[PDB]
């Protein structure tokens, strides 16, 4: 069973090295995904991360919604939107039949605050035919489980047809209790190109 | 034992993915840690990092002590301070009882010279009650072993009183022989919030 | 005695014209002194910024610490640091044996707010052998008297030895009550060059 | 043998954490390698520009060749050159006898387009005594296998003599079919310093 153990380990490390899932992320910014910033919720305003230069206060740092489609997920490498429900609109790198979505959040064991009450909880994903459409087509309703794994994957609804989209709206309907903001670490969109 | 093998493999990968330790790093900058840069020793002037804009090279610069609380540890992603003695002060993201510290350095197999003579060797960690306090509380005396693993963990002295700290000072007294500078790749602080 | 009156007046005016003291200020910027701004406390962050660029407000400060070694002391021509404790590190124009220090603050009669609660109160001066030295040599402990004259002079500790210094640190431990910041109008260093 | 399984897993993870190879990359930019961009093929011209200035569109490119010696290999973090033939000139962090080379490309499973036709195919590596040398010394001829692993290693020609090199040229003679450009994700140089 030694060679079999090596095979299991190598297979797990291979999957791990492929963005943990082995699946194309069509939202990923470096691959061509982008945030439609005017269709995102308001970013949480905080004057507590002060950037200075030669001791001179220069500007207050806050993360933009772009970080949601970037792979780094160390604590704090997340977009914080104001309040406990909000939305994010993503233009995908290709026109696809969306098949599944991934949400990542830091595990509690790494959270400096002791909890992940700022994680998203109830959410839904919609396909938009253009950047001006309000609601779009429901692709699925889900819950990110604060007691589950850091990375959670969700299957899109099966429809009699396969309508393709290049714009998806993530609607976060609730968070896990944080009284000021909700933090999104990474959102991925998987599916089949046209 | 195949299911057990997969369990061992998955458990190791999960721990690996959790910042290798599975423990909150209260010094990590993105999580709320901060360098008190006026309370660091002198940066060695290396001018070995290139800055570019739109693909155009602009100028070379030296890494600041902020990289000590940032997770990237490829060769060169370290703060180089002048000589073989130095100090660094970090404000933590929470008031904690410190339990342990982690120092990382690149392994010898990744160092171009074959050695890590610039790695820190003897060091001590102090708890500070405020950022103007000159004499802090000794939390431990340690040696980073150049013949050990890249990531090394160090247990804090525990004292019967429950004094919590939100400021830590790292004092490096010696390095592994480099005559010009010492390179710190990453320093982490672990413990329990109050 | 009319000639004696004219002599008294001319002597007082001569001393007044000689920077009010008739003594070299080795900290004076135009004479070769300089602020080591990377070793000074952070400048107080004003509520609003000086400009905006690409929608981001920039520069939340009023004066840089250089004004502490410039002679103009009209109201507002002072360096404000956050809170009531801070420090300023100055490189002198020459290596000297420090003999005395001067602190100036605006008089109450010129203060728009009616008070000088932002004036420094308890302070000490240390000589440093270099700007990264953690603990300096105490040159003296003093109090700026809010009920005294605008310009106050302080005698350096009488010393058995003669170690010269070209770097001094001014440490402010308290102010006269302002809850947000402390304002330094001018700090001077006097002594004998080596 | 549970301990043997844990040993297999820990060894594989240790090697994985050591830049996947456990070998110095003398080309790595943060470790001291650099692109000699004036000696490299021209970067692929994208269809649209990044900005406009005074009515003129500027910057028709995606990534500069520096990314070839940076470790991130998420899709799109690659240098694209025009067509299917090109060259990249790298100054190494030390004078070495080159022993092996590594080329990485994204796996097909992460490619948005479904294919990796833009991956390099036939290539050779030459050692140069200086960056203006017209004809270099062949260190080896190789093919990146699109049906192989993402990371592939190639053994340098066994040489009777030991001439060291600090400059290498990577010459790409063909790609895996993309009609517009070829994408290089990461190139590494391994060997023994002199």
């Amino acid at each position: 069973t030694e060679a079999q153990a090596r095979a299991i380990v190598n297979s797990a490390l291979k999957l791990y090295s492929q963005d943990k899932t082995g699946m194309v992320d069509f939202a990923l910014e470096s691959g061509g995904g982008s945030i439609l910033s005017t269709r995102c919720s308001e970013t949480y305003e905080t004057k507590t991360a002060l950037m200075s230069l030669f001791g001179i206060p220069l500007w207050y740092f806050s993360q933009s919604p772009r970080v949601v489609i970037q792979p780094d997920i160390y604590p704090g490498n997340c977009w914080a939107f104001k309040g406990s429900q909000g939305y994010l609109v993503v233009r995908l790198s290709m026109m696809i039949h969306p098949a599944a979505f991934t949400l990542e959040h830091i595990p509690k064991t790494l959270s400096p605050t002791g909890n992940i009450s700022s994680a998203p909880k109830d959410f839904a994903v919609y396909g938009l035919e253009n950047e001006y459409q309000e609601e779009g087509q429901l692709l699925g309703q889900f819950t990110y489980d604060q007691d589950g794994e850091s990375l959670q994957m969700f299957q899109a609804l099966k429809r009699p047809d396969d309508t393709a989209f290049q714009i998806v709206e993530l609607r976060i309907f609730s968070n896990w209790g944080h009284p000021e903001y909700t933090c999104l670490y990474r959102f991925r969109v998987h599916g089949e190109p046209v | 034992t195949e299911a057990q093998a997969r369990a061992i493999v998955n458990s190791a990968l999960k721990l690996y993915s959790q910042d290798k330790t599975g423990m909150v790093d209260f010094a990590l900058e993105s999580g709320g840690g901060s360098i008190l840069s006026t309370r660091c020793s002198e940066t060695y002037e290396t001018k070995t990092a290139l800055m570019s804009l739109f693909g155009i090279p602009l100028w070379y610069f030296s890494q600041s002590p902020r990289v000590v609380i940032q997770p990237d540890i490829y060769p060169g992603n370290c703060w180089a301070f002048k000589g073989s003695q130095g100090y660094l002060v970090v404000r933590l993201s929470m008031m904690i009882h410190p339990a342990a510290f982690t120092l990382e350095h690149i392994p010898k197999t990744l160092s171009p010279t074959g050695n890590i003579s610039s790695a820190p060797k003897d060091f001590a960690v102090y708890g500070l009650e405020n950022e103007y306090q000159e004499e802090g509380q000794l939390l431990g005396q340690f040696t980073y072993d150049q013949d050990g693993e890249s990531l090394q963990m160090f247990q804090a002295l525990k004292r019967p009183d429950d004094t919590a700290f939100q400021i830590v000072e790292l004092r490096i007294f010696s390095n592994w022989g480099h005559p010009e500078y010492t390179c710190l790749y990453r320093f982490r602080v672990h413990g329990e919030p109050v | 005695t009319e000639a004696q009156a004219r002599a008294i007046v001319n002597s007082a005016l001569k001393l007044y014209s000689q920077d009010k003291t008739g003594m070299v200020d080795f900290a004076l910027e135009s004479g070769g002194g300089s602020i080591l701004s990377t070793r000074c406390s952070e400048t107080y962050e004003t509520k609003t910024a000086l400009m905006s660029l690409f929608g981001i407000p920039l520069w939340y400060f009023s004066q840089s610490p250089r004004v502490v070694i410039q002679p103009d002391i009209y109201p507002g021509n002072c360096w404000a640091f956050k809170g009531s404790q801070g420090y300023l590190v100055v490189r002198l124009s020459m290596m000297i044996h420090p003999a005395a220090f001067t602190l100036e603050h605006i008089p109450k009669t010129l203060s728009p707010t009616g008070n000088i609660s932002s004036a420094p109160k308890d302070f000490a001066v240390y000589g440093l052998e270099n700007e990264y030295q953690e603990e300096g040599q105490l040159l003296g402990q003093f109090t700026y008297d809010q009920d005294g004259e605008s310009l106050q002079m302080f005698q350096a500790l009488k010393r058995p030895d003669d170690t010269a210094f070209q770097i001094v640190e001014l440490r402010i431990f308290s102010n006269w009550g302002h809850p947000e910041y402390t304002c330094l109008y001018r700090f001077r260093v006097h002594g004998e060059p080596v | 043998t549970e301990a043997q399984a844990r040993a297999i897993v820990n060894s594989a993870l240790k090697l994985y954490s050591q830049d996947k190879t456990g070998m110095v990359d003398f080309a790595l930019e943060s470790g001291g390698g650099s692109i000699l961009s004036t000696r490299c093929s021209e970067t692929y011209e994208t269809k649209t520009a990044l900005m406009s200035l005074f009515g003129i569109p500027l910057w028709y490119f995606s990534q500069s060749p520096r990314v070839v010696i940076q470790p991130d290999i998420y899709p799109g973090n690659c240098w694209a050159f025009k067509g299917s033939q090109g060259y990249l000139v790298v100054r190494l962090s030390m004078m070495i006898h080159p022993a092996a080379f590594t080329l990485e490309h994204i796996p097909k499973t992460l490619s948005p387009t479904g294919n990796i036709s833009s991956a390099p195919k036939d290539f050779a590596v030459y050692g140069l005594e200086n960056e203006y040398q017209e004809e270099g010394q062949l260190l080896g001829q190789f093919t990146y296998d699109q049906d192989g692993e993402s990371l592939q290693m190639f053994q340098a020609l066994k040489r009777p003599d030991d001439t060291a090199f600090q400059i290498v040229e990577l010459r790409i003679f063909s790609n895996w079919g993309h009609p517009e450009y070829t994408c290089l994700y990461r190139f590494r140089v391994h060997g023994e310093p002199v």
Binding site: M51, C78 | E29, M51, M94 | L53, G55 | -
Partner: peptide
Amino acid sequence: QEDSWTSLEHILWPFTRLRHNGPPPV
């Protein structure tokens, strides 16, 4: 505008100091 600001932020990032005066969102 945001593209302009993020590229300027890229240029600024290494040279600035960052002080947290309270916990950032995590």
